[PDB]
Every structure is written in structure tokens, then in C-alpha cells.
Design a protein around this ligand. Structure first.
Ligand code: 0JO
Ligand code: 0JO
Lengths: 378, 383
């Protein structure tokens, strides 16, 4: 069927190609050295969707399956656990190379807090995690399952973030929040560096395949992952020879609207309000294009990934996890496919990296989308 | 989420447990012995959906995956190829139990997809001709499938039943051999063999369940005219008896001929192409009237739900490619599960924690276009 989903593409006019040594090969190698020493480490699968590539008119679609990231069903773990380890290695005067085996506070709509909760349990320390209203019970239960304190509020994530701040300064907690703001940059920097492990894995995995990625699609909420992963990839592949596309939901396209203006200006995980300044700076510098897409584009991605084409490997991907792949699928069935493919420079030679950032973190919603066809194309 | 799709259940008030000797274990053995002699024969997988059965509160959900049947993506050839070989054994006075390899005959049938394909393929394999007719609105991909076997295919301006009559006429006019998977006045011999040919899948399924050490308490059988249901249930009740099998006949809302025949006790467009019905198959009807426990008339979206559930399995369950007509049996189980009145519907269907439910996935993605519209785009969604 032919259908038109909103997929607004805008060229980054503020692109300068200025890389960030702060997020590079060397730091990601230190970040990966850390994660390698964690019990049950395994590089997550880089799945080759060959038959879907041939159907879409490109050479390779390659998906980093972050649903395999230990038992957490998401990638976020990579940042939080690294920053928590760095925070202690600073406070207790140690070297990050030795990994011998008091309270961390944060707001999350799901994955980030689970990462912080898991790391706290692993290191014997405590964790208090705040969640906004409407958040799934399964996601609350998973945080309590790790032995942390989880409180569901009555206000939105941006308002809830203030509550975590006022509580942590009044009780004595250490804020391990995945976004930066004036007077708070140290931890988010480490988080973004910790994320780069997945890009480091994917690069080693791509070299083993013997391919060179021409494109990358990165979903963005506050842009911490996009920033950290893009900054690494452009350090490896150059900002000029990697066509990076940042993907945001229609109702929370802060980074898109920021790229549109120049200055700083739905699926849980990709909600924004205010963009992460550390992330923004990298995307403003090195991101090729920004996409603002409809809600149902993510839903499509989940279905395409969960029921693959031909003989491609199946991938379990959540709403925020599947939106990059969804863009490619929405472009394929769009009447303006030709001009959309040209605008994104997607052609028979395009090798496309996609990051599946989470699995079925909310089973109820996941199965409502893929079985019931909630948020259908129609 | 919680949702209500139309799933009307009717007890078969005319059940009497009279089996049919024409559809038994011995005549399924002869069928399967014939199929084993054909190149590329492999029993189709019986997939255990252990995690879905857990979710649904039953013991076992086992799906016979007929998408794997001889590269044809459907089960229908099991009958077509068997009838055709039997006809050749009448024409050349040959023994079927002995022959295997190889005047020009022409085989003619109406189909809305799979039957004709099964016929066309068999004519190709035996170096004969096939002329296949198709009702208006038939998927171009299915027209192409038949042509790609070296057979003629014509898409008429008429419905299924009228196209069948045009096939009859043209066959008399040209001297063709009509190979139709339905019966009527003066035409019962071939659709008997066709029905006997289908029992091969049930024979395999019974053997496979035995290797697993299970015994089915339930079978869900989708129906168009009821040749498959009739042929398959007829064998199954010879194995397990009509009384020990809770057999449920599944039909689409817009073409529930066997359901409507069920409530009355006499012979009386859907997204489930294959399950369309104008007039029921009287040969299949006799078996269903007799041994079918219940009939289900259901909404089109029930098949769509089944398709999605099968193609994106729960937990660690095996993935199955299942088409619109192929998935509706499973779709019933999934529709009941999410229904507000789940408990009562489960009780009605006598489904509990011990139920070993056999489901027949009768075809894979025979219409790739529609299949992906269901499973990717969410066409015919619950809401
Ligand atoms: C805001 C959150 N979500 C982040 C997230 C994102 C967005 O990451 P950034 O906030 O770093 O853009 C993408 N994909 C998945 C699966 C995610 O969980 C959070 O975990 O609290
Ligand atoms: C009418 C056709 N199909 C019937 C069919 C049926 C219904 O079988 P009966 O017509 O024997 O009821 C079930 N499943 C699939 C995949 C089918 O193709 C045909 O192949 O022409």
C-alpha cells in the first residue's frame, strides 16, 4: 500500500564538521574497557537486514540490537553505570582500569533509571528513581525488581526533573541524570562517553563484515545518545563522509526545532522539552540532517523489525527503539519515495546503520502495536 | 488491551458422531504413501507455541505449518495432485500404489488462489496441461503464480460459483478434465479424492504429536466450502473419535455458509480469500454436520490478528508466516484472550489449562502485498 506519513526532513545549515575529542575513539575505548570487565559482557548483535535492504533499494541495512545489553533490554545501562563508576573513582581516589568489587537519584520515563538502579545494586549503593505520571507499571516494577526506590509523580518529566533536584540537594543524594544544565555537566559527559561503547562495538562488527557505513540514523530525546554516538562515529568516519540523520517524534522535536532556529528551542524515551546542551553541540556541528516524524512511524518500525522480510533476522524493538528503521520503511511506501530517497542521499550503494535502542520494555504496548495494530498506518 | 471482535459460537445441534469410512486412517495412509513418492516431499513442521499457550491459559498450541508444503506456500496441492494422479490411473488402468514417475490431458478448475496453483503444479510435474479460472478481484500475484507454472489463467467478470459453472461448460466444450475442490449434483468422485488427499497433513500431525507424546483435545478448522475441514476432521475423528475431539469450525463473517448451515441443519467480499463460500461442499458438510462440535462465525479482523500473532511470536516461540485464510483459527484464540468475556468464551469453547489445541496454518504469505499490510501497516486493526 502507498501511504503518506509525516516525515519532515531539514538540512543542518549550522554544520561545521568540528569534532569533539571529548567523545572520540580513545575515550570510547576506555569506556569499553570498563564494560568488558562487567560480568556477562557480550557485544550486542549487529543484524544484517539484507532482504529488507534489497526491498528498500539500498545496499545494507544494519541494526545494532541493544535489547541484548545484559538483561536490561536497553542500551542506557552503558552510560549510567560508567558515570557511577567514574563518580566513585573520583571520590575514592582510584584508577578506572581496576574494577574491584552512597545514593544515586534520577528522573526517568523508563530505561535510564533502570540502568542507574542496576548499577547501584551491582555496587552495593542505594538508588531513588523518580518517574512522571502515566509511566508504565512494568517499568516501575523493573526498578523495584532491582531493589531501588521508585516514586511516580503527578507532573511531566521536565517538572519531575526539578523535584529530583530539590530532593537531592536537601537530602544529600548524588544526581545521576542523563541531561546537562548550567552547573551540571560532569556526569552527563561520562554518560555520553559510556554510550559510545555501542558505536565502538558496531564499528568492530562492521569491519568484520568488511563494510563502510555511508549513513547513520539516530533517534533523539534530549540527544545524549545521538551526541555521544555521533561524536564517536565522526571521529572514526569523518563528519563529511557519514550522512547522519537525527530522528525525533513530531510532538517533541526539540533538536529539530533547535537546528531550524540555530539556538536552543508520545513514545517514552524521546520526550524532550529542553535539549541536552552537550548533545546539541555535537549534533549542531556534525549532524547532516534532522527529521521530525509522525508518531505512527515508530509503530511501523517495530512491526517491520519484529516480523522481518525474507530470511532476515527478527528483532524485538520498542517504540523509541524502532523509529530510525521506521523512517526507512515510511520512506519506502511514501508516494514521494524517489525525492525522499534523494534528499537523504539513500541509493543502491547506501550502507545504513540503525540503532535499536530498546526491546519490548513495555510488553503491553509492544504487543498492542505489533498484534493489535494500534497506531496503524491508516 | 481489552477489545471485542465479533466471535459468535454455535453448538452443532445436529452432532451424532457418525464417522466416515471414506475418510479414515487407511485411506490417509494410501494418500501419504502417494505423496512420499513425489520429489521434494517433507512433512511440514508442527510448531509448538509453548509461550503463547501459557499466555492464553491452555496447555499446548500446536500449529501445522502448511506454508512449507512442496514450495507452494499452501496445503491445497495435497488433494489436487492426488485426484489428478487417480484420474491418470483410471485413464491408463494403472495401479496407484506402484506408479511414481510420469496422450496429453488438460486439467481445468476454478480457484481463488491455492487450489488452481496446486492443480497447475501437478499438471506441470506430469507434463500435462492446465487451464485455471479465477473470480473477479483475484490478487494479481496469485494469477502470476499459476502462469509461472506454465498453465493458462483467466480472471472472469463473475463470482466464484458462476466461474465454476463456466469452467464446467468450457471443459465439456473442449474435452477437459474438471478438477474442482467442491461437489454438486453429478460431480462427487474427484472432490472425494481431493478431500482424501488433504488427510496427509493430519496423518503427519498425528504422527508428530505422537513423537511429542501429546494428544489433542481441540482442533480449529477454517472453512471455505468445507472440503479441508471435512477431509481433515473425518480422519481425525477416526483417530481420536468424534466425542473426544472438541472440533471448532471457523468462518469469516461475510461468508459463513457452514455456520449458517450449522444453526439450521441444512445447506444454506472477505479479506480471507480462500474462505469465501456461496454454496457449501455437501461432501464436507456431511462430516461437519455429524462430528463438528461447534461452528464459529467471526469478524475479518480476527484473521488479521492471527496473522500478526503468528508472524511475531510470543516469548521464544517459533515464527510462522501465515496468510489471511491461514491464520484465522489462531486468531480466534487470540481474540478470545483479549475479550472482556474471555472466561465465559473459554468455558463455551471448553478451553482450559489442559487443552491441547491443534491449529492448521493452511497457507503462508500467498498475497505478499496484503500480508505486509496486515503485519507492518496494521491493516484491519483491532481498533
Ligand atoms: C529519556 C529516556 N529515554 C531515552 C531513550 C532514548 C533517547 O536518548 P537521549 O535522551 O539520549 O536522546 C532513545 N532510545 C531509548 C530506548 C531511550 O530509552 C530515559 O531513559 O529516561
Ligand atoms: C477456495 C480455495 N481455497 C480454500 C482454502 C481454505 C478453505 O478450504 P475449503 O475450500 O476446503 O473449505 C482454507 N485455507 C486456504 C489457504 C485455502 O486456500 C482455493 O484454493 O481455490
Amino acid at each position: 500500500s502507498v501511504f503518506s506519513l509525516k516525515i519532515d526532513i531539514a538540512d543542518n545549515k549550522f554544520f561545521n564538521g568540528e569534532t569533539s575529542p571529548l567523545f572520540s575513539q580513545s575515550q570510547a575505548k576506555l569506556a569499553r574497557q570498563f564494560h568488558q570487565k562487567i560480568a556477562g559482557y557480550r557485544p550486542t548483535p549487529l543484524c544484517a537486514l539484507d532482504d529488507l535492504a534489497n526491498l528498500f533499494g539500498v545496499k545494507k541495512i544494519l541494526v545494532k540490537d541493544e535489547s541484548k545489553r545484559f538483561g536490561l533490554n536497553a542500551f542506557k545501562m552503558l552510560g549510567g553505570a560508567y558515570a557511577i563508576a567514574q563518580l566513585l573513582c573520583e571520590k575514592y581516589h582510584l584508577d578506572i582500569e581496576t574494577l574491584s568489587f552512597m545514593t544515586f537519584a534520577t528522573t526517568t520515563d523508563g530505561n535510564h533509571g533502570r540502568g542507574v538502579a542496576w548499577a547501584a545494586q551491582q555496587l552495593g549503593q542505594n538508588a531513588v528513581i523518580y518517574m512522571p505520571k502515566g509511566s508504565a507499571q512494568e517499568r516501575v516494577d523493573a526498578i523495584l525488581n532491582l531493589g531501588a526506590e521508585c516514586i511516580v509523580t503527578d507532573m511531566n518529566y521536565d517538572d519531575t526533573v526539578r523535584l529530583t533536584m530539590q530532593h537531592a540537594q536537601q537530602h544529600g543524594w548524588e544526581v545521576v541524570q542523563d541531561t546537562a544544565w548550567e552547573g551540571y555537566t560532569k556526569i552527563p559527559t561520562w554518560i555520553m562517553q559510556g554510550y559510545a561503547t555501542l558505536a565502538d562495538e558496531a564499528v568492530e562488527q562492521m569491519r568484520e563484515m568488511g563494510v563502510t557505513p555511508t549513513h547513520v540514523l539516530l533517534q533523539a530525546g534530549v540527544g545524549a545518545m545521538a551526541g555521544g554516538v555521533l561524536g564517536y562515529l565522526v571521529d572514526v568516519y569523518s563528519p563529511q563522509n557519514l550522512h547522519s540523520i537525527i530522528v525525533e517524534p513530531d510532538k517533541a522535536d526539540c533538536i529539530y526545532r533547535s537546528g531550524v532556529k540555530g539556538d536552543i528551542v508520545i513514545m517514552a524515551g524521546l520526550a524532550c522539552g529542553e535539549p541536552n546542551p552537550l548533545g546539541w553541540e555535537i549534533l549542531r556541528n556534525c549532524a547532516t540532517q534532522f527529521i521530525s516524524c509522525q508518531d505512527s512511524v515508530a509503530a511501523l518500525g517495530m512491526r517491520v523489525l519484529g516480523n522481518p522480510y525474507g530470511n532476515d533476522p527478527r528483532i524485538i524493538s520498542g517504540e523509541s527503539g524502532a523509529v530510525g528503521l521506521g523512517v526507512l520503511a515510511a520512506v519506502h511506501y511514501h508516494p514521494q519515495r524517489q525525492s525522499l530517497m534523494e534528499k537523504l542521499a539513500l541509493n543502491k550503494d547506501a550502507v545504513v546503520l540503525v540503532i535499536s535502542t530498546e526491546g519490548d520494555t513495555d510488553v503491553k504496548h509492544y504487543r498492542e502495536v505489533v498484534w493489535e495494530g494500534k497506531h496503524a498506518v491508516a
